Amino acid sequence: ALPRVSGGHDEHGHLEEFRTDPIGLMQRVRDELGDVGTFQLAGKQVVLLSGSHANEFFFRAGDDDLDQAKAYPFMTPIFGLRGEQMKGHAATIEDQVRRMIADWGEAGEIDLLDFFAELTIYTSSACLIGKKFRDQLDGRFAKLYHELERGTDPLAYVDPYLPIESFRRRDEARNGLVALVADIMNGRIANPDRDMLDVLIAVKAETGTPRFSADEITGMFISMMFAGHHTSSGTASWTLIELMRHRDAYAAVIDELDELYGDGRSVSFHALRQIPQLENVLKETLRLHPPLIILMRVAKGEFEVQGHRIHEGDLVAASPAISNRIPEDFPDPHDFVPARYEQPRQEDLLNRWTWIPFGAGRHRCVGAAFAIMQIKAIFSVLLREYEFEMAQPPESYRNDHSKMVVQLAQPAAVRYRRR
Ligand code: HEM
Numbered sequence: 001a002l003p004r005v006s007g008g009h010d011e012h013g014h015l016e017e018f019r020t021d022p023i024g025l026m027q028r029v030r031d032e033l034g035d036v037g038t039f040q041l042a043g044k045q046v047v048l049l050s051g052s053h054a055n056e057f058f059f060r061a062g063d064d065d066l067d068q069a070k071a072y073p074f075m076t077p078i079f080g081l082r083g084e085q086m087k088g089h090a091a092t093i094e095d096q097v098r099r100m101i102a103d104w105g106e107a108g109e110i111d112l113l114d115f116f117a118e119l120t121i122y123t124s125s126a127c128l129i130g131k132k133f134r135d136q137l138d139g140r141f142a143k144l145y146h147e148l149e150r151g152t153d154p155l156a157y158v159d160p161y162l163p164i165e166s167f168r169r170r171d172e173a174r175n176g177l178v179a180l181v182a183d184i185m186n187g188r189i190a191n192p193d194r195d196m197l198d199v200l201i202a203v204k205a206e207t208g209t210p211r212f213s214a215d216e217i218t219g220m221f222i223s224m225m226f227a228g229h230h231t232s233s234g235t236a237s238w239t240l241i242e243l244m245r246h247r248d249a250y251a252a253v254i255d256e257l258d259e260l261y262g263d264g265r266s267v268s269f270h271a272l273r274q275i276p277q278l279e280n281v282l283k284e285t286l287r288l289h290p291p292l293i294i295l296m297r298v299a300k301g302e303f304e305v306q307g308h309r310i311h312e313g314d315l316v317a318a319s320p321a322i323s324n325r326i327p328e329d330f331p332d333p334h335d336f337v338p339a340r341y342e343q344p345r346q347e348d349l350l351n352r353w354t355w356i357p358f359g360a361g362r363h364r365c366v367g368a369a370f371a372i373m374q375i376k377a378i379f380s381v382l383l384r385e386y387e388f389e390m391a392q393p394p395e396s397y398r399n400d401h402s403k404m405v406v407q408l409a410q411p412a413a414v415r416y417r418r419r
């Protein structure tokens with residue numbers, strides 16, 4: 001029997017705690033057991049790995065050893081990048097941001113979750129599907145997509161179809177998205193530049209009838225946008241929050257942006273090049289607030305890690321939330337220190353197996369370049385156009401960890417004023 005963390009005396013073991021304070025649970029696993037420890041998620045044992053040694057095993061393991069295929073049961077009901085194009089995407093993102101703030105005026109107040117959740121729906125759809133498709137979208141799409149993400153309660157590890165309100169809303173939201181897509185398809189029929197939707201609409205089945213239904217197309221689009229939406233949305237929100245919490249960093253970023261853009265080149269040029277201060281703020285934001293706090297796998301065989309035996313069928317997990325703060329690897333792990341990424345320390349590069357907001361090894365984030373470029377493009381526009389201030393106590397900004405998809409809790413109010 002592998003070492004088991006304390007508690008977990010509820011009906012589904014540690015499931016209830018996982019649904020309320022997953023980070024505290026995972027930290028207790030490490031504090032009590034070390035690099036290899038377990039907790040019970042309903043009828044499934046989760047082997048939580050942490051530390052460089054254990055993480056190296058996790059990230060260097062291929063599909064034949066650790067598989068992600070059936071590690072996330074909450075996604076089944078929901079589903080149903082090249083540098084060459086990066087310059088174009090940067091310009092697209094700049095355009096989407098300018099469109100989102102077009103009605104801001106001289107001063108006002110926004111809720112970060114509402115703002116960035118909607119903005120990232122537009123940037124994601126425009127870049128991945130096409131500008132033509134994004135132009136046929138409005139706030140409704142973002143609202144429905146949010147419901148999908150809110151439908152990821154860990155109870156899915158018991159059963160993804162339990163009769164609970166969040167799952168009911170998840171299913172209703174997906175039907176709503178199918179209807180929006182169907183409306184767009186019908187709109188193109190009556191009122192005819194092409195995008196991915198046009199490509200799918202054109203395919204015919206072995207009978208002359210359209211191959212893909214609105215439902216199938218919607219599932220494809222939902223899946224294409226799922227990796228980058230909540231992650232980019234949360235990262236943008238927390239980047240702004242930490243800049244406001246640390247005015248010295250904010251000031252340094254502003255001076256840097258004003259100096260860099262002084263060469264007269266566009267955001268599509270600069271968002272693909274170094275913006276030092278902002279990049280380090282982003283790295284530190286990701287270390288402290290990793291959008292994915294836990295990564296899951298299903299063991300396909302028997303492996304030994306530090307004397308601990310892992311058997312086939314076992315759920316195996318790594319945690320950016322916990323690993324990103326190991327005190328031995330990151331001096332003063334709970335403090336916001338962008339300087340830890342400067343050439344002298346480079347703590348992100350030095351800790352290859354523990355600085356994992358973007359994963360590592362064979363599972364390196366393929367969208368990281370795009371995500372970093374997006375943050376650079378977004379803030380190149382926002383910070384040069386407006387000044388931001390917190391509208392609530394600095395310590396009151398927090399994440400909601402009740403669903404597998406972590407999202408900012410409300411309120412998250414910020415005030416702006418033209419520069
Ligand atoms: C700030 C935003 C993002 C964060 C923090 C993030 C984080 C991660 C993490 C932690 C991993 C490793 C997951 C694992 O080991 O199971 C990863 C892998 C990956 N990410 Fe992202 N990601 C982000 C945005 C994106 C975007 C925009 C895309 C889509 C274009 C994307 C596509 C992928 C893919 C395909 C993998 C490879 C998975 C594998 O090989 O197992 N990511 N990402």
Ligand SMILES: O=C(Nc1ccncc1)[C@@H](NS(=O)(=O)c1cccc2nsnc12)c1ccccc1
Nearest residue numbers: 068072075226227228231292294295404405406
């Ligand atoms: O893995 C998830 N999301 C994600 C986002 C960005 N980068 C990497 C992963 C997501 N599970 S998923 O939707 O099945 C999924 C999407 C894309 C690539 C994947 N590789 S493995 N699973 C993938 C998720 C959301 C919330 C908590 C954990 C996992």
